Design a protein around this ligand. Structure first.
Ligand SMILES: *[C@@H]1O[C@H](CO)[C@@H](O[C@@H]2O[C@H](CO)[C@@H](O)[C@H](O)[C@H]2NC(C)=O)[C@H](O)[C@H]1NC(C)=O
Ligand SMILES: *[C@@H]1O[C@H](CO)[C@@H](O[C@@H]2O[C@H](CO)[C@@H](O)[C@H](O)[C@H]2NC(C)=O)[C@H](O)[C@H]1NC(C)=O
Ligand SMILES: OC[C@@H]1[C@H](O)[C@H](O)[C@@H](O)CN1C(=S)Nc1ccc(F)cc1
Ligand SMILES: OC[C@@H]1[C@H](O)[C@H](O)[C@@H](O)CN1C(=S)Nc1ccc(F)cc1
Ligand SMILES: *[C@@H]1O[C@H](CO)[C@@H](O)[C@H](O)[C@H]1NC(C)=O
Ligand SMILES: *[C@@H]1O[C@H](CO)[C@@H](O)[C@H](O)[C@H]1NC(C)=O
Ligand SMILES: *[C@@H]1O[C@H](CO)[C@@H](O)[C@H](O)[C@H]1NC(C)=O
Ligand SMILES: *[C@@H]1O[C@H](CO)[C@@H](O)[C@H](O)[C@H]1NC(C)=O
Lengths: 390, 391
């Protein structure tokens, strides 16, 4: 999408995985989807160094809407849970120097049964812009035909442009299209800033593996299309929650950087361990994710329960990720000739290699003739940055 | 098996899950199966408070053997990886007040291809006794028929007894019997101190869920059989490794306490987080596992991605574990009438409830009519102790 936005992968916070569709504000007032929840995350994004790290978009997922549209056919925030309205919430978020994302659906309903946008693409777009909304996540539930889906995503895309406001456009277009016919990613990129490719993430190592396995399997179809203004979206970061070990959290951070993925955290900033905070705020790794070149990484090789991924960076630098998919035993040794890395120009005639994850450690100079040797924890990942000696 | 041993569930350290069958001592000297590894593990069990916590048995799994037997038909430790021999290693372990476990197989190979014990049950048992071995893990690989399997496990049990030495007898008998016919646990309890029921654990939340789900599915078949001298073995503790989140580590510890399981750690004591160490050394939770009554717990109820487990303790006390199997979202509220806990006698007429996991917190007095209210993390477990009392 050529609207000048998402020149690097969008970074921010999205409530869905951690808070879902909690409407019980009476017995769980602190976890329910409400204006208060987003106010609290906004404050901590500022005060706990999240904004300084690049996390800029505070996004509302499903279940913010009133059950019905007002008398003039426009969408409504829930009168009890969002009593000051979305525009006033956007004003607050902007006052702290952040941007606001919101959620709508191409179909007749959102996935949680709330009013869909089909038949209202223009008024909804103008409504969002008038509210001061800076991002739109547009879901694909309750849509009958393939044609209405494609027409709807396109219609909304043009509708946003014509508002005149800069609004990052998030699509789930290919996800709802895949089980029927293969997507045109050139067409999708044309209308969308990012696009969800695969099933919802949750708080598990199983989910992460499924995403990595689907991406590497379909990479000849999705890697090259990605670039400034249009990214593949393998869904939210779930680091800082309950279902991932430290090494599995490391694997998600490393690989979502390799994949040039949007970094939308879905966690509770009010309750997050120092360990998870430092990982999510790792400047060197975020910088890899945010590389100006914007070329998505890919899976180099795969065998012996090992995976090697690499991503070309600006200034002849490369990022390399080695995963240990063996879920038994201890740290396993993996060795690769550095000449096989970076299509053969990363370490020619030499390169300096720096480990970034799980810990930052200079490994030194590697000659064109050299072999990189590493021990990787089960379900963990080693992330390296390679600087060519020229 | 009443040989006077395993009156409470055996506690110790077993190398298999973390180190497996690493034989490459030249390129992986820190992970290979060698006398030095067990020597150093022995030192740390003492110095890092593991022995004081109850972890008493240092156990060698598969891949300690030389490729074949000596001139006298006896088993040999590998001359390169165990150059000082098992006897001197047992002497070393005993000097630190610990006990040594070793591994053999009913068939005529171990699972990793090293010399098996079929045809050598007596000499192998006597060999172990002469070496000073205090525990035997007896595997069931490369065994053809049901009767050779059953006879082999029986024979070794008697072969060990006739040595006169106290040796905890750990069997994998029922696990290797499942693919033929369902096991007779009465016969098994007669010959074994504990027994492996299900497939090997590994370093994952999937394996733990898989072990819990089969245990509760088969619990009316295996729970009552458990007691002093004979326990169900749902395999090693993998807390302290790489594949479990903190809440999943809590879940294993809590439920291995509930199940009255042997607590065999499989980790690297040289490299373990303070957090995993404190959990593994939790006296209150260990005490539940080691409860003198020796009655195995069970799954009370199950629904809405929740599980409730409970275990009757000595002195009219109960341990209660609540699991959240939902792997998305946040902490979930769960509420239960305390009269439904401990078969209605735990809080009769009242009980004092103390939370042990994820953190220790006194909850106070609950009368028979009252309701227990709790929040459980995804894939986590809340562990409670209920003490019957009058107030
Ligand atoms: C609407 O779309 C047009 C293009 O279709 C956007 O104009 C582009 O803006 C970028 C940076 O602002 C320029 O580098 C491109 O050259 C422009 N393209 C054309 C064809 O003019 C415009 O920014 C979009 N408007 C909004 C509000 O997003
Ligand atoms: C060999 O088996 C016998 C038979 O059970 C064991 O003898 C029992 O020992 C326990 C405690 O030591 C006593 O309470 C039982 O009364 C004994 N039974 C009989 C029939 O005497 C004996 O301990 C075993 N010996 C070894 C070395 O395992
Ligand atoms: O509401 C839809 C739901 C969530 O609320 C979030 O908005 C998104 O993360 C995605 N989402 C859903 S159902 N995605 C989805 C759509 C189709 C499918 F086959 C599997 C998953
Ligand atoms: O070598 C065998 C292996 C280990 O080394 C240990 O001895 C034990 O933890 C068990 N073990 C094996 S393969 N156990 C096993 C796992 C699944 C199965 F269907 C039958 C047996
Ligand atoms: C919305 O519902 C109407 C009425 O059933 C239907 O005709 C229309 O096709 C639906 N739109 C989509 C996009 O599914
Ligand atoms: C897909 O990309 C663009 C988008 O409309 C289109 O021009 C192109 O012809 C399409 N290619 C195929 C093979 O459909
Ligand atoms: C052990 O060896 C003998 C002879 O090779 C054979 O009869 C038997 O099946 C083997 N395996 C067993 C007993 O599990
Ligand atoms: C199982 O227990 C003993 C073990 O020898 C045996 O005598 C008994 O008959 C068996 N029970 C059944 C129901 O087969």
């Amino acid at each position: 999408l050529d609207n000048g936005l998402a020149r690097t992968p969008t970074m921010g916070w999205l409530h869905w995985e951690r808070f879902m569709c909690n409407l019980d504000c009476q017995e769980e007032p602190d976890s329910c989807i409400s204006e208060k929840l987003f106010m609290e995350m906004a404050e901590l994004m500022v005060s706990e160094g999240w904004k300084d790290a690049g996390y800029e978009y505070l996004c509302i997922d499903d279940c913010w809407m009133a059950p019905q549209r007002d008398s003039e056919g426009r969408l409504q925030a829930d009168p009890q849970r969002f009593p000051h309205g979305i525009r006033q919430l956007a004003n607050y978020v902007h006052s702290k120097g952040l941007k606001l994302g919101i959620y709508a659906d191409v179909g007749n309903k959102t996935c949680a049964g709330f009013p869909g946008s089909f038949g209202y693409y223009d008024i909804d777009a103008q409504t969002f812009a008038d509210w001061g909304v800076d991002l739109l996540k547009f879901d694909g539930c309750y849509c009958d035909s393939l044609e209405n889906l494609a027409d709807g995503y396109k219609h909304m895309s043009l509708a946003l442009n014509r508002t005149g406001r800069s609004i990052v456009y998030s699509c789930e277009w290919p996800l709802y299209m895949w089980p029927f016919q293969k997507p045109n990613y050139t067409e999708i990129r044309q209308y969308c800033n990012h696009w969800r490719n695969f099933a919802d993430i949750d708080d598990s190592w199983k989910s992460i593996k499924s995403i990595l396995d689907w991406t590497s399997f379909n990479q000849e179809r999705i890697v090259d299309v990605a670039g400034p203004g249009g990214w593949n979206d393998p869904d939210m970061l779930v680091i800082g929650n309950f279902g991932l070990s430290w090494n599995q959290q490391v694997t998600q951070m490393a690989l979502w950087a390799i994949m040039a993925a949007p970094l939308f955290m879905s966690n509770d900033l009010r309750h997050i361990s120092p360990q998870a905070k430092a990982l999510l705020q790792d400047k060197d790794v975020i910088a890899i994710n945010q590389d100006p070149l914007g070329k998505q990484g890919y899976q180099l090789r795969q065998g012996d329960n090992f995976e090697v991924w690499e991503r070309p960076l600006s200034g002849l630098a490369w990022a390399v990720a080695m995963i240990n998919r063996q879920e038994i035993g201890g740290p396993r040794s993996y060795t690769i000739a550095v000449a096989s890395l970076g299509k053969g120009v990363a370490c020619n005639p030499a390169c300096f290699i720096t480990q970034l994850l799980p810990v930052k450690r200079k490994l030194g100079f590697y000659e064109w003739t050299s072999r990189l040797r590493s021990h990787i924890n089960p379900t963990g990942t080693v992330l390296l940055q390679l600087e060519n000696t020229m």
